[PDB]
Amino acid sequence: PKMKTHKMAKRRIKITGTGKVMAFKSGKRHQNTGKSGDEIRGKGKGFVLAKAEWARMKLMLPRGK
Amino acid sequence: MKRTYQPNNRKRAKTHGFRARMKTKSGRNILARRRAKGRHQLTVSDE
Amino acid sequence: TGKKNLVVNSVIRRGKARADGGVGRKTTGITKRVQRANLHKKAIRENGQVKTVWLSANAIRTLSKGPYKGIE
Amino acid sequence: PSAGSHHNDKLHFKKGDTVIVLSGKHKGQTGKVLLALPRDQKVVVEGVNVITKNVKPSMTNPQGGQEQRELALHASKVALVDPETGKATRVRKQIVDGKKVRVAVASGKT
RNA sequence: GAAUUGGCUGUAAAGAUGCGGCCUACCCGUAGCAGGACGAAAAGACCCCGUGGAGCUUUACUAUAGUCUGGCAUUGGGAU
RNA sequence: GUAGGGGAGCGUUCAGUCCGCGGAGAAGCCAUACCGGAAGGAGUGGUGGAGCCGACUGAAGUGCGGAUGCCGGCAUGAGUAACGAUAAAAGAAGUGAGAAUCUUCUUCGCCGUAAGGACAAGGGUUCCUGGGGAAGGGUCGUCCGCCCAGGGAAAGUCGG
RNA sequence: UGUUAUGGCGUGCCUAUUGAAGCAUGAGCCGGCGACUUAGACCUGACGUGCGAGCUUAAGUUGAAAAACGGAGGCGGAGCGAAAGCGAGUCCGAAUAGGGCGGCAUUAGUACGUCGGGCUAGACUCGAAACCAGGUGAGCUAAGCAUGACCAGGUUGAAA
RNA sequence: CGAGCUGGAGAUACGCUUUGACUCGGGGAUGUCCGAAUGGGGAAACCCACCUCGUAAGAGGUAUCCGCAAGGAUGGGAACUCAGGGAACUGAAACAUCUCAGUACCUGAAGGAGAAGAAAGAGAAUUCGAUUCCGUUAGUAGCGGCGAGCGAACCCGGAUCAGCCCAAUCAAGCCGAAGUGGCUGGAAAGCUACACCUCAGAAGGUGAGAGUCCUGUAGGCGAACGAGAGGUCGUUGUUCGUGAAACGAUGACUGAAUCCGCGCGGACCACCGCGCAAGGCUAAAUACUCCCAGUGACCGAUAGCGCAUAGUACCGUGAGGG
C-alpha cells in the first residue's frame, strides 16, 4: 500500500528547501476588532513550527507538496 | 419427568424428511449442502 | 410489473435540515438517507386475441395514440 | 504400495523357464519356475525350500505335523540362464518365424 | 506450587506451621470433632471503573412503518 | 541493576557446497568424576538397527514453567465414598476347572385396580434352540436383555 | 563419586506492585503443541555493495537443468509564492525592514540487500458481553383448530 | 499384451486360459427402484391405475411451458462471471452524514469462461480510434462532519487484435547399451582387483549404498476404433456526500427537431473542436480450479486435509458439529 498524503496538511503546511516545515500564524478570523493592528498584521503571515512538530508533518505529506 | 425427545415415525418423516426438504429452496439447499459434505445420512429417510 | 418494460425498481430517499440560507447558509446537513420504492397502475386491453394485463401510465398514453405492437 | 508397481507388474521371465538365483543365500543354485506371480513379483524355484508347520488342525490329521516346501522369492533374485555361458544372463528381444518374439543373450537363445 | 506442614509472643503488605525469641514434641496409624490451613467451589452477582453491552422509558436527538393532507396521473361529458 | 537501548555469540530444522562417517553398526535413547566465559561441547561404555556428524553460506513454522493455556498419559484424595428403595431369605440336590449368585426340590417372604393380563406409540431380532464367557452385568457368575450360529413371524373375513 | 551425621547459614516460582515467603494471581505431574510475523515494489534511518552527476527499471518478450532483453515510467538535477508567475532568486510591500532560499568557508546521488522503526492489513498470542445476515426448530413448553377417550363410590337434595 | 488368472480379502472349494484368458485402450448391449421424476398418489427409494401391441411372459406410452410441426426447456455443478435484493459489527478513540461496503449473505440466469465491444467516445495535439486485462501515470487531480478517511482518468509502455449485418499432433503399447572375480557380512549394491556402455549417471525395486541384476531412462517405432432524445420533481453512478453540478440512469408527469438538422465538450452564452443516440451478434488476450500431470530451502502421524482416509464413530429433534 502506498502511504497516502494527509490532505488536511496540504493547505496549511509547507516543505522548505533545507527540509524544515512551515505554517501560517493563527487567530485572524473574528478576533479582529481586538485588535491590535500589529497583531492582525503579525498573524495573517507565515512561520516555522517550533520543532517537535516536524516529524509528524513530514509524515503528513510524503511528496513534500 | 417427561423429556424433550418423544419419538414419532410420522412426525420425523413429515418434518425432516426427504420430500419435506425437497418441498422448499432452503431444504433443497440443505440437501445439496449435505451431499457436498459427503454425509452418509443425507436425510432422516436414510435412517 | 409494466406493460412494455419491467418497472418497480428504486432508489433511496434523503432529506436535509438547515435547508438553505443565503444561497449558502453554513451548509446543508442531511439527517435522512433510507430506502424507498416507485410504481405505476392497471387496466385491461388485448393482443393476438383476449388478454387483460397491467399497463404503465406511459403505456396507456403510448397505446392510446397507437399500438406499439399490442392492441386496445 | 505393491511390489509390482516398481517393475510395472512385469515378469522378466516366464513360468517353466529355468532360472539362476542371483542374490542371497541360495546364490547360483538353479531351477524350474514352478510358480510366478507378476503383480507381487514372487517366484518359486525348487531350491529355496523351508520347513513349515501345520499347527493344530485335525485336517490334515489331528496332531500337528511338519512339512518341507519351497518358499517363493522376489523376482529380482531370478534370471534366465544361457546354455552356453551357463550363468546369469541378460536378454535381448529378437524375432523368429511366423510372428514369434524370442529371447537371446550375447549369443541367442532361450 | 512443592512439603521434612506444633505452641506462645513478636515481626513482617497491617490475621505466620515456614521470619525472630522462647516453649513443646519418640516413629506410624484407626475411629471420631469441625478452631485454623484467610479451607473447596463460581476470574464478586454489592461497589467503582470502561468515552463496554443490552432490555425498558419518555414532552432527549435523529429517522421511520403507518397515517392525515395539497398538486400530477388513471380521469370523461354536460348544465348553472 | 527493573523497564529500555546497544554489542558478541550458543542451539534447532531445512537448503547450497566442501569434508567425511556408517552392518566390524547411523540418527534417537541411557550413564558418566572431562572441556569451554555462558548458551553449550566432546571422550568412553550400554541401547538400538539405517541412516548421519563437522565447516562455510542461505532461508525459518527456530529455543517455554507459567497463559484457571491445548492434546495426551499417569499420580493425589484411597483400598477411602459407594455398589441405586429395608418386599427377606433358608436348606437340600445338581452342575461345574471354579458357585452366596446358574439349575431343580422344599419352604419362607413381597405385589395382587398390581409389582397380574391385553393393546397402542416407540424399539428392532432383544423371541425360540444350541453353544460361548473377553468385555457389557455396579460382586460372582458355569448365568443373561451380552457374544456366535441356525431356526421362528403365514389372513378374502382383525388393522391399514 | 555415592551416601550420610552434626554444626553455620537460608522467607518457593511466576505475575502484579509503593511494597510478596505472604493468609494476594496462576499452577496436580511429566511429555508433546503453544505467542512480535507476513505483505507492499509504500515511508523514514543504520550498515553494506554496485555504478556515480548521474542511478534504476515495471509490466512484458525470449530463453529457461540458466538468464538476457525490455527506458514506459521513477529518483537526483532550484528554489520562492495563495497562485499567476518570477527565477539564484522569490514573497509581503510603493520601496524598506523581513521569511523562505542559493552562495555558502564545503559538502552526491541512485539501485539493490540485511537490519532498526513507521504506515495499512487479523499485525505479539488467547479471551468477551453483544450487532447483523441466511437458515433450523411447537417429537419439550405456550396456545388454537378437527377428531376420539376418561372421571370408583359416597353425600347434599335447586327449579319445575 | 502374451501367461497367467479366479476384486480390496490375504480364506477353503469350483474352475477359466496359447482357439489368446487376466489386465490396458475403444466403441456398443443390458441398465431394477428413487431422485428435475414426468401416469396418479406419496412420509424419496413405496402404494394405486388407464391405453396400444402381445399368446401370456413382456414391451411401450400416459407431467408441465414455447411452438403448426420438428425440436427446445425444467435439474445438478467448488470456485470463477454477470444481474435483481442487499447487512452489521467496526473505523470515525462517543455518534447520526461518513466508514466498513456494494464487502457478507440471499435470489436469478449462463458458460467452459463470462462480461464488455464496433464511439451522439476519450480528450485539447484541430491528437487518438471497439472491449477486456497487466505496468504506469499516482496516493497525482479531485472527494470529505474538508474529520476519520476515500481516491480516478488522460498520455506513455505492454498482452491480444475484428469487426459484420438490419429498419424507409495427443489417447493403449512395443524396441531399447554395458561386469565379473575374490573379501566383510545373515544377506552385496558396499570394499577390492582389473573390466565395459553412455543421444542412456532421471528415478524406483533388489536381504546395506547397484550407470553395466529387474523396471526404466536417451532414442526410435506405434495402431483398425479414439481425439483435436429534452425537460421538471424524487434519486443515484464514476474522485462526484447539493456543491456553482455538467453527463449518464430511471419512478412519476410531460413530451422536439431529421442534414442550414441532431448530441456532447463540468452551471450558463457566443465561438472554436469531437461526435451520427433511440436496432442486433461477435473469437482473441482475462477469471477460476471440483478433476489431471510436474515440481518444492512445504509437512511426515498433536505435523500435513477434519481422515495415512471418515464426514465414519460419536453428539444434536433439526440446521448442524465431529
Ligand SMILES: [Mg+2]
Ligand atoms: Mg514433623
Ligand SMILES: [Mg+2]
Ligand atoms: Mg506491629
Ligand SMILES: [Mg+2]
Ligand atoms: Mg515460628
Ligand SMILES: [Mg+2]
Ligand atoms: Mg525455613
Ligand SMILES: [Mg+2]
Ligand atoms: Mg463431618
Ligand SMILES: [Mg+2]
Ligand atoms: Mg472480578
Ligand SMILES: [Mg+2]
Ligand atoms: Mg409516508
Ligand SMILES: [Mg+2]
Ligand atoms: Mg551490569
Ligand SMILES: [Mg+2]
Ligand atoms: Mg547440510
Ligand SMILES: [Mg+2]
Ligand atoms: Mg535428520
Ligand SMILES: [Mg+2]
Ligand atoms: Mg504445563
Ligand SMILES: [Mg+2]
Ligand atoms: Mg480449578
Ligand SMILES: [Mg+2]
Ligand atoms: Mg488434562
Ligand SMILES: [Mg+2]
Ligand atoms: Mg479397609
Ligand SMILES: [Mg+2]
Ligand atoms: Mg478420608
Ligand SMILES: [Mg+2]
Ligand atoms: Mg470409613
